[PDB]
């Protein structure tokens, strides 16, 4: 999940 | 949390510094455009804005105090609302026009025109109120936290969001009091600002319908991120 | 000049309270609706009757009658489901986990768990109801919020602007009357108005479902409900 | 035309 990834970064 | 410890002036400073930049589109006046390709431009622009928005959200006081799943949900709910109030804010000084990008100024010329007129009316409302930059960043943060607050111990997270929202309310009043407004004028302006958010929500909902209507018609290549953001509103 | 602006705060409250439509009953027959036909049948029938009262309610909202007939039509077409929903949410305050469409029609999410794509809207309404309950929303506050919805939701203008301001003053008046401090007042005012954004969201999702209900063939829609629905498309 | 136009008069 792209949004979860970018937020987790 | 340190967000609950911030003064109103600190809150404003934090929000102002977290502001994303204004991006350029791929628009070329010498290049012909159809409705399909124009939507391509806006899609490309929105996709690049989303990355900036995600990093902006992390710098909104109180946002990273939340679980990742709650962070995801709020952004999924609010992303088009946030884009739209940004668009409306940029368009204030251009009556009858929408400034999608510094190189993309479009005037009114399906129900896409209706959404267009709705955005123009909101912009007109902003400039008649003489909306301030400090107020705008407060409004935008409210949208992020409020639009998805109501989609075990998940209630603890909901409480925190409400307390931060109360903080932004205090901040708005502080800004208005500093602007020399009487108490009656403060309460009235506060109401005026928050009622606009209902309108921004409406435009977002209508916008999602058209984007879903788009996607299904092959018409325009949606980005991988936009597809996921869009799909979240289909469930 | 409108007499709405000349009203005192207490007079504004009295006018809105007096304008209140009654709580209508659903058809009897104690069959708990667990079908998309029966429940949408019941809800459509109720909403159709509620609409007639809403129209006559709106005419008694100060400032509304001062608008042109077409502007009155526009505002009602834009806001009717919002108005139905905030009324539903208000009625359901004292019944946590339940939606009181009528005193003899009390539904839970397990009944909403029927009908494709309604349990989500069900949950949203329940959340709004719980929020109103935890805020101890008062009846005088409720009628102010409902009037705000009517006047604001389709506002896009100066007359409506001043009337909206007048209702804001009225809300503040009620909170000050309730003994709240200045800070508690503007905090509560903000909390109430932010919920109006959620009501807008629920209405728009509701329109989609009603349009979806219409496109099939399940419940006969009244001509009135059909015209109110078509206005959003 | 619209039913709403009639009902708002009465
Ligand atoms: C569909 C309604 C329309 C109204 C305003 C302009 C719109 C968009 C928009 C809005 C704000 C903005 O800064 C950049 C782009 C948009 C276009 C395509 C897309 O895939 C996502 C967003 C959407
Ligand atoms: C799950 C709740 C929600 C979902 C569908 C839309 C709803 C309503 C509805 C249903 C059918 C209809 O034709 C017109 C309006 C409704 C709202 C408030 C009220 O007092 C009565 C009916 C109810």
Coordinates of C-alpha atoms in Angstrom, one line a residue, chain B residues 63-234:
Chain B
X63 CA -0.8 14.0 13.3
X64 CA 2.2 11.7 13.8
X65 CA 0.9 11.0 17.4
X66 CA -1.7 8.8 15.6
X67 CA -1.3 5.2 14.5
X68 CA -0.2 4.7 10.9
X69 CA -3.6 3.2 10.0
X70 CA -5.3 6.3 11.4
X71 CA -2.9 8.5 9.4
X72 CA -3.7 6.6 6.3
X73 CA -7.4 6.8 6.8
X74 CA -7.4 10.6 7.4
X75 CA -5.4 11.3 4.3
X76 CA -7.5 8.9 2.2
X77 CA -10.7 10.8 3.3
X78 CA -9.3 14.3 3.0
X79 CA -6.8 14.4 0.1
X80 CA -9.2 15.9 -2.5
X81 CA -10.5 18.3 0.1
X82 CA -7.0 19.5 0.8
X83 CA -6.1 19.8 -2.9
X84 CA -9.3 21.8 -3.5
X85 CA -8.9 24.4 -0.7
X86 CA -5.3 24.8 -1.9
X87 CA -6.6 25.4 -5.4
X88 CA -9.3 27.8 -4.1
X89 CA -6.7 29.7 -2.0
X90 CA -4.4 30.1 -5.1
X91 CA -7.3 31.4 -7.1
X92 CA -8.4 34.2 -4.8
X93 CA -6.6 37.0 -6.7
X94 CA -8.0 35.7 -10.0
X95 CA -11.8 36.4 -10.2
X96 CA -13.6 34.0 -12.6
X97 CA -10.4 31.9 -12.9
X98 CA -8.9 28.9 -11.3
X99 CA -5.1 28.8 -10.8
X100 CA -4.3 25.1 -10.9
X101 CA -0.6 26.0 -11.4
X102 CA 1.4 29.2 -12.0
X103 CA 1.5 28.2 -15.7
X104 CA -2.1 26.9 -15.7
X105 CA -4.8 29.5 -15.3
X106 CA -8.2 28.3 -16.5
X107 CA -11.4 30.2 -16.6
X108 CA -14.9 28.7 -17.1
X109 CA -15.1 28.0 -20.8
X110 CA -20.3 17.2 -18.2
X111 CA -21.0 18.5 -14.7
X112 CA -17.4 19.4 -14.6
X113 CA -18.4 23.0 -15.2
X114 CA -20.6 22.8 -12.2
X115 CA -17.7 21.7 -10.0
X116 CA -15.8 24.5 -11.6
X117 CA -18.4 27.1 -10.7
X118 CA -18.5 25.7 -7.2
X119 CA -14.8 26.3 -6.8
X120 CA -15.1 29.8 -8.3
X121 CA -17.8 30.6 -5.8
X122 CA -15.7 29.4 -2.9
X123 CA -12.7 31.4 -4.1
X124 CA -15.0 34.4 -4.4
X125 CA -16.1 33.8 -0.8
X126 CA -12.5 33.7 0.4
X127 CA -11.6 37.0 -1.2
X128 CA -14.7 38.8 0.1
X129 CA -13.9 37.6 3.6
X130 CA -10.3 38.6 2.9
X131 CA -9.1 35.2 4.1
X132 CA -5.6 35.4 5.7
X133 CA -2.8 33.0 5.2
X134 CA -2.7 32.1 8.9
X135 CA -6.4 31.3 8.8
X136 CA -6.0 29.2 5.7
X137 CA -3.3 26.9 7.2
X138 CA -5.6 26.4 10.2
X139 CA -8.5 25.6 8.0
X140 CA -6.4 23.1 6.0
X141 CA -5.2 21.3 9.1
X142 CA -8.8 21.1 10.4
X143 CA -9.9 19.4 7.2
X144 CA -7.1 16.8 7.6
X145 CA -8.0 15.9 11.2
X146 CA -11.8 16.3 11.0
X147 CA -12.9 14.9 7.6
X148 CA -12.2 11.3 8.6
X149 CA -12.4 11.5 12.4
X150 CA -15.8 9.7 12.0
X151 CA -15.0 7.2 9.2
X152 CA -11.7 -1.3 21.2
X153 CA -9.4 1.4 22.5
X154 CA -9.5 3.3 19.2
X155 CA -11.5 5.9 21.1
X156 CA -8.2 7.2 22.7
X157 CA -7.1 8.2 19.2
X158 CA -10.4 9.9 18.5
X159 CA -10.1 11.9 21.8
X160 CA -6.6 13.2 20.8
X161 CA -7.9 14.4 17.5
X162 CA -10.7 16.4 19.2
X163 CA -8.2 18.0 21.6
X164 CA -6.0 19.1 18.7
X165 CA -9.0 20.4 16.8
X166 CA -9.9 22.5 19.9
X167 CA -6.4 23.8 19.8
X168 CA -6.8 25.0 16.2
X169 CA -10.1 26.6 17.2
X170 CA -8.3 28.5 20.0
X171 CA -5.7 29.5 17.4
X172 CA -8.3 30.8 14.9
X173 CA -9.9 33.0 17.6
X174 CA -6.4 34.2 18.7
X175 CA -5.7 35.3 15.1
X176 CA -9.0 37.1 14.9
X177 CA -8.7 38.8 18.2
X178 CA -5.2 40.0 17.2
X179 CA -6.8 41.3 14.0
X180 CA -8.9 43.7 16.1
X181 CA -12.2 41.9 15.6
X182 CA -14.9 42.3 18.4
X183 CA -16.1 39.2 20.1
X184 CA -19.3 39.1 18.0
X185 CA -17.2 39.5 14.9
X186 CA -14.8 36.7 16.0
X187 CA -17.7 34.2 16.6
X188 CA -19.3 35.2 13.2
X189 CA -16.0 34.9 11.2
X190 CA -15.2 31.6 12.9
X191 CA -18.6 30.3 11.8
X192 CA -18.2 31.6 8.3
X193 CA -14.9 29.8 7.9
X194 CA -16.1 26.5 9.2
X195 CA -19.3 26.5 7.1
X196 CA -17.0 26.8 4.0
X197 CA -15.6 23.4 5.0
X198 CA -19.0 21.9 4.5
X199 CA -18.9 23.3 0.9
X200 CA -15.4 21.9 0.4
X201 CA -16.6 18.5 1.5
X202 CA -19.4 18.7 -1.0
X203 CA -17.1 19.6 -3.9
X204 CA -14.8 16.8 -2.9
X205 CA -17.6 14.2 -2.9
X206 CA -18.8 15.4 -6.3
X207 CA -15.1 15.4 -7.5
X208 CA -14.6 11.8 -6.4
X209 CA -17.7 10.8 -8.4
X210 CA -16.3 12.3 -11.6
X211 CA -12.9 10.7 -11.0
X212 CA -14.5 7.3 -10.6
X213 CA -16.6 8.0 -13.6
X214 CA -13.3 8.9 -15.3
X215 CA -11.3 5.8 -14.2
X216 CA -13.9 3.4 -15.4
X217 CA -14.0 5.0 -18.9
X218 CA -10.3 4.2 -19.6
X219 CA -10.2 7.9 -20.7
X220 CA -7.2 9.0 -18.6
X221 CA -4.3 7.1 -17.0
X222 CA -4.7 7.5 -13.3
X223 CA -1.5 7.2 -11.2
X224 CA -0.9 4.3 -8.9
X225 CA -1.3 6.5 -5.8
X226 CA -4.4 8.2 -7.1
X227 CA -5.9 4.8 -7.9
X228 CA -5.4 3.7 -4.3
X229 CA -6.6 7.0 -2.9
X230 CA -9.7 6.8 -5.2
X231 CA -10.4 3.2 -4.4
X232 CA -10.6 4.0 -0.6
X233 CA -13.7 6.1 -1.3
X234 CA -15.3 3.2 -3.2

